[PDB]
Paper text:
Interestingly, [name] has an uncommon binding loop sequence with a Pro at the P2 position and Trp at the P8′ position, suggesting a unique mode of intramolecular interactions between the binding loop and the protein core. Here, we report the crystal structure of [name] at 1.84 Å resolution and the structure of [name]-trypsin complex at 2.26 Å resolution. Within the loop, the P1 residue, Arg45, is an ideal substrate of trypsin, which ensures the inhibitor's tight binding to trypsin.
Its main structural elements comprise a single α-helix (α1, residues 18 to 28), a central parallel β-sheet consisting of two strands (β1, residues 30 to 38; β2, residues 51 to 56), a binding loop (residues 39 to 50) and two irregular structures at the N-terminus (residues 3 to 15) and C-terminus (residues 61 to 69). The Cys4-Cys49 disulfide bond stabilizes the binding loop by connecting it with the N-terminus. As in other canonical inhibitors, the binding loop of [name] forms a hydrogen-bonding network with the protein core. In free [name], a water molecule forms hydrogen bonds with Trp53 at the P8′ position, Arg51 at the P6′ position, the α carbonyl oxygen of Pro44 at the P2 position and the α carbonyl oxygen of Asp46 at the P1′ position. However, in the case of [name], there is a Pro at the P2 position instead of Thr. Therefore, no hydrogen bond can be formed between the P2 and P8′ residues or between the P2 and P6′ residues, resulting in an extended binding loop distant from the protein core. After superposing LUTI over [name], we observed that the binding loop of [name] was approximately 3.5 Å more distant from the protein core than that of LUTI.
Author numbering: 3 to 69
Write the structure that this text describes.
């Protein structure tokens, strides 16, 4: 079971770099990783990782979550 804030629906539509910094400030246990929308990721579960999926303009398009 993870601790701290688990999802950031409010960051959809923000620049990926800005989102990553907010995420890491708001939950000190996680690393945000900015990747293109649709990028293949490992199918494991972690409490210290937040995928930040962005469109071709570098803007967050999926809700970042701890996973």
């Amino acid at each position: 079971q993870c601790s701290g804030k688990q999802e950031w629906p409010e960051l959809v539509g923000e620049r990926g770099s800005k989102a990553a910094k907010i995420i890491e400030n708001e939950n000190e246990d996680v690393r945000a990783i900015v990747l293109p929308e649709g990028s293949a990721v490992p199918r494991d579960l972690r409490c210290d990782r937040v995928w930040v999926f962005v469109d071709e303009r570098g803007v967050v398009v999926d809700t970042p979550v701890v996973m």
